[PDB]
Each structure stands twice: as structure tokens, then as C-alpha cells.
Design a protein around this ligand. Structure first.
Ligand code: CA
Ligand code: CA
Ligand code: CA
Lengths: 219, 219, 219, 219
């Protein structure tokens, strides 16, 4: 019976039947957004949902017999596994993000279809040749975030009060979003020289970030 | 008479006459902006308009005899047809956008002058090599937009209350416009961890967008 | 005496003396900024100023005999001419920007020192390649500016009231600065569909702008 | 004893031991952030802190007996010396920033580990091929900063009242952060034509900056 199912799984129908479900459940999840649609057809789509979740475990099970150990060393499969697992944890208990993380299954349209897979893979593969920079930056952020916490946190706790807050504000400055009117100008009303900490921080972080982009244009 | 008009139409004078009209109607449309100019010479400009709009249909009518099926297979020609058509819909009824959409005819200066055509074509040609990434993001936006509507839309309906609002707000975060002061910091007053949804969202969307530019920097 | 002066002007010492003056008149202008410094050395600086202006017209006159027609076909020389000329209009009559535009002469440090010239020339040379796009954009800006003035300027005259205002606001949207909180979110409280005019505008203008940069990254 | 200590210094164990201390002191400094942790275990920390500082001077002393002049001609060695130096000035007197600047020793992780050194050196190496442009810009900023201080600093002294302030505001405009709503729109309520100073400032500065990036996508 092994080869019987291995012929069902690898079957074009089966794969295309999955893709067909994803695009339906996808459509169904955006409808679950509407408070109106739920008061009409809520019970409809809740069954339809639990239905699909079964079909996906059945599939992921069948998918496993056909592949065994090979499957738990496939990125895309592991994904599909973990994303279905999330959808299995009972519609209750613990944290309620689990009801919300369920929409991560629509990322299966990425897994279950090449070209998507291509592009994702194209994208991801650029990451390792960035990790040197990413390391440098994180160290940099870590250092300045500490300095900032101990230079502005006392008068400005909302923004620098805690190591994490400073991380956040520093990230915010790096995206240059409202950095001068929102932060440094206020800061300067008390710490006139605070510009000395933030202009350099901006030059460095943006310089590095430009390099990181030109890096991905020579690779 | 066929070859007679095919020598009128295809003539230098003809094209340069059309171009001469465009640049003239264009100037006329910037003048229709001034409430002053209209209280003076409004009658002048409304007739001038109907005049040019006639001339353009005559031309588009002529243009079709000389070309038949070749014409409704020319991007640029179809454009002019569609654009002139919009300008034909009476100055009344339906929506007023139609009255406003008329100014789209000034895009004929692109259609009816090479180099422009070249440049436009240069640009448009880059698009198909982006559709994979574009597909990817549109899926991504859709997934997060749904997630956001159900994580934040109750306490924050202006921004995430509806699927559409979430799309809009998410777009806004992507342009990095006022994302931290305007949205996340507020969100965090109630959902302390909301940062865990938006920072990753920003890395992903920024990263992708960097690649999409690096792609166009090789093709 | 022609070759006598042509050996004075073309002389190293002459150039290095001009340069030495620029950097001094430069420093002196940053000091004319201080309200304090003027109350102590204002006369010193106004005299020093009138002096240098003479020295520069002498130079520009000499430079002319040594070059004649060759001079008024040199960008860099013409610049120095026009710049010095500006500095010549008396400390009165007319507009008062003329008194302010005087500081444009510090751009002589660029004109009269190779290396700057090189880089400047390196920069300017990129512009011709961009004019097809720049034309395209300007046409586009002109078209949307007109649409905006007639779609939004009745309720929103600060931002779209006049063809020029719209230009400005549209420019602002293109720099993405505060475009959603500042403008479109407001517009939508009255024109729910305004998003349909601004999202496309943003895509197009940012797309083009990405091309334009990638263009320069090839020529 | 020389070759004894030369063998100790050059020893893998020694370098790795240093690296181990850095990652421990690093973790310590992030913990020194918590007012809780400090009440509990501050003593533990400040002493562990002083210990590390001793070890590092010893190391830096040893490192010099083994390199002499070769050391003070090594950027990385110089760095380390100057950083530990900072950390050495007592926990009192002068400017309390020194106490804060101590955290700069965590940059030793960069210096004591290659790959980091590689990346940093990769990064820095790009700077000289930029100094022509940087000089250009700095001249530019200086000229406009002066113009602004004298065109706007009387009615708008927060932003332009001083050469320094104008420098800051001009930088802010360059990052495009809040430049229209924050500054020019206000400015224009008094100086209608102020747009003529800032749109050009923006074009130039953005253009130059695009060139600078493309310059690094060649070199
Ligand atoms: Ca911004
Ligand atoms: Ca802002
Ligand atoms: Ca504000």
C-alpha cells in the first residue's frame, strides 16, 4: 500500500487539490474579518475551517510516510508541519495568539507552489552574506542602547528608561522616523549636546546600511 | 480615398499638429485652475475644449481606418482611444471624476512623442521581472493585514478596524511614515508586545524591497 | 604688457592667493553670523569684505584680458563672473536677497580648485542622462497637480487650493514626509476614496525614482 | 623572559581568554542597566568591573613589550589602548561622560576578533573614495547654513537663529524628516518664497547623496 499512497501524494491532482484549498481558506479567513459576515455565515466557516485543518494533517501525515526522515530535513516541509501544528492547538487555553497565528498557514501557498519558492529561496540566500554586518550592527545597537539608557533614561524614561526602550528608540532613529522633532530636539532642551550622540549614530547606521545594500549588488 | 488619408494621417504635419494641440490644451487646463481666469475667459476655454475633443475623435476615427485591427493591438493607440473616450462622456451625470479624468489626455504628449514612449517603455518593461516579488508581498500584506485586523481593530478601529484599514495602515508602516510615534507607540500603551508584530514586519518588507531594487540593478 | 599680466594671472601664486582669500572671506562670513562679533568687529569685516570684492573684480578683469572670448565660454569662469557681479550690486536698492546671495561666492572654492571641479563635473555630467525621466515626471506632476487642485482644493485649500500649492503638496508626498497622517488620512475624513489618488501616485513616483537611480548605476 | 611573555601573549589561549572577558563584561554592562539588579548585586559588579579593567591594562602593557613601536602603528592596538585608557580615568571628576564612555570597550569584541576586523576594514576602506563628495557637501551645508541663519533666524531662531542651529536644521531637512509640516510650511507663513531655498537644497543634497551611493556601487 506504500507505493499506492506514494502515487496519490506525488500526484499532480493531490498537490493542486492542496493549492486549491489554501486559496479557499485564504479567502475564507479575510471574510472572517467582517463582523457582518460572521453574524450571517459564522458557523459555516468555522466547520469549513476545522475541515481543512484535518485534511492538512491527513496530508502532512501521508506526506510523511512517503518521505520519512527526508521530510524532517526539508525546510518547506518542516514549515508546513509547524504551521499546521499551530492550527491544531485547541481553540482555547494559553495565549490567544494561537487563534491568530493560524493565519500563518496561508504562507503554504508559498511552500506548495514553485516560483514563490524560487523567489523566497532567492531572497533568503542573500542573508548569510549579510550576517557579518548584521552582527556588527547588533553589537553597535547594543552598545549605544546602553549609553543612551544611562544618559537620557532618568529624564526621559519613556524613550530610554530601560535597555529595551532605548533599543526601540534607537531603532526608530535608524529608520529616521520623526527622529529630530520627536526626540533629539526634546532631548536637547535638557541635554544641549545630545546631538553629539545622535548625528554620529545616524551617520554610522546609515553608512553601514548603504554598504549592506551595495553588498547585495555585487553578490 | 484610402491612400489619400493614409498620406494625410501618416504625415509629419499631422502628428506635429496633434502634438501642437496637446501642449496647447495642456496650458489651457492649467489656466482652468484659476478661479480668476475662469470668471474672465471661461467661455473661451470651454469651447476650445470641445473643439480639441472633436479634433481628437476625428483623428482617432481617421487613425483607425488607416490601421484597422493593427490599431486595437497597439498599446499607445488603445490608450488614446480610451483616454479620448473618457473625455467624450458628457459634462454631466454619473460621477464628476469623469470631468476630472479628462486631464488624462495630456498623457497623449507621452503617447504621441517618441523618446517619451521610449522612456515609458523602458520603465514598463522592468515590471514583469518584479511580479514574483510583487506577488509575494501582496500575499504578505494580506496575511498581516488580516492578523492586524484581529489583533488591534477593537481598541484601534481607525487603523486596523477593517481589513482595508489594516491594508492602508500597513502600507503606511512600509513607507515608514510616522510608524513609531504615530502607531506603534500608541498601540503599545495597550498591547505592550505589539512591537513584536511591527519590527519584524518592517525588516521583512524593507529587506524584500531592497532586493527588488537590487534585481532591477542587474536586469 | 599683455604677456606680463598673462604671466601674473596664469601664475601659481595668483591662483593660490585667490584660494587663500576665498577661505578667508569664507571664515569671515560665518563670523558675520554672530550678533556679538558684529558689535565688536563689524566695521573690520565690512571693510575686509568691500576689499575682497575689489580684489575679485580686478582678478575677474585681468582674467578676461588674458582669455577674452575663451573666458565667456568657460562654465567655471562665467560662474565666477556672475557670482562676483551679484556681490557688486550696492548694499541697497531692490530686493535684500542680493546682500544674502553674496555668500554664493564661497562656491568659488569649488570653481578655483581642481578636485572639486572634477567631482562637480562628475556629478553634473550625470544629469543629461536623466532628462528623459525628469521630463516624464514633471509632466506627471503637472497632470496630478491639476487633478488634485480640482478634486481637493475646495475643502483643502491650504494643501491643494492653487495649482502651485498642489505642486508642493505633491512634492511632499513624493518625499513621503508625513503623507498619510498629515494629508491623506485628513482628506479621507471627507473624500473616503482619496486613497485611490495617492497610493498610485506614490507607487509611480517611487518606481520611477528607483529606475532613475538604477539608470545612473549603469552609465 | 621576553620570548616567554611573547609566547604567552601570542598564545591562542590568551586571545580567547580576552575574548571571553569581553563577552562577560559586555553582559555585565547590560545588567548594570537594571536599577533592580544594582540594588541586589551592584557590589559584585563594580568589583568584577574594576578587575577586568586591571587585567586589560596588564594585557595592554604586555602587548607593548611584545610589539613596541609596531603596536602604536597598529590602528586596532591604538584603539584598544585609547579605550582602556578612557576606562582608566577614576570614577570621578571632570565630566561624568567618561564613566559612560567606558562602555566603548565592548568595541574590543570587534578588534579582538577577525571577520569583524575584516568587515570593519571593508567598511572603512570605502571612506576615502567618498571624501571628495563629503568635502563638497560640507562646503554646501556651510554656505546654506549661513544663508539660512541670515534669512530666517530672526523670526525663527529655534531652527535658524545661529550658525549651529541652521546646520542642525539643514541636516534634518536632508534626512527629509518632517521638513514640510515641521519647517517649511511654517516658514512660509512669513516668508512665502522660502520654498525656493528649500526645494533646491533638497534636490541637490538628495542627488549628491544618490551619486555617493552609486559611487560605492562601482568601487
Ligand atoms: Ca518621515
Ligand atoms: Ca514627523
Ligand atoms: Ca506632529
Amino acid at each position: 500500500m506504500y507505493l499506492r499512497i506514494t502515487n496519490i501524494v506525488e500526484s499532480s491532482f493531490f498537490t493542486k487539490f492542496i493549492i486549491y484549498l489554501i486559496v479557499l481558506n485564504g479567502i475564507t479567513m479575510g471574510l472572517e474579518t467582517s463582523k457582518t459576515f460572521m453574524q450571517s455565515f459564522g458557523v459555516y466557516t468555522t466547520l469549513f475551517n476545522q475541515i481543512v485543518i484535518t485534511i492538512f494533517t491527513i496530508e502532512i501525515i501521508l506526506r510523511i510516510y512517503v518521505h520519512r526522515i527526508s521530510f524532517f530535513k526539508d525546510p518547506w516541509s518542516l514549515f508546513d508541519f509547524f504551521v499546521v501544528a499551530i492550527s491544531l492547538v485547541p481553540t482555547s487555553s494559553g495565549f490567544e495568539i494561537l487563534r491568530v497565528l493560524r493565519v500563518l498557514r496561508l504562507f503554504r501557498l508559498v511552500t506548495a507552489v514553485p516560483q514563490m519558492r524560487k523567489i523566497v529561496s532567492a531572497l533568503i540566500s542573500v542573508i548569510p552574506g549579510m550576517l557579518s554586518v548584521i552582527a556588527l550592527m547588533t553589537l553597535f545597537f547594543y552598545i549605544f542602547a546602553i549609553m543612551a539608557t544611562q544618559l537620557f533614561g532618568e529624564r526621559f524614561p519613556e524613550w530610554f528608561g530601560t535597555l529595551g526602550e532605548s533599543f526601540y528608540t534607537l531603532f526608530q532613529v535608524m529608520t529616521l522616523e520623526d527622529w529630530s522633532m520627536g526626540i533629539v530636539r526634546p532631548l536637547m532642551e535638557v541635554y544641549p549636546y545630545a546631538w553629539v550622540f545622535f548625528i554620529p549614530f545616524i551617520f554610522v547606521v546609515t553608512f553601514v546600511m548603504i554598504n549592506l545594500v551595495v553588498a547585495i549588488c555585487v553578490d
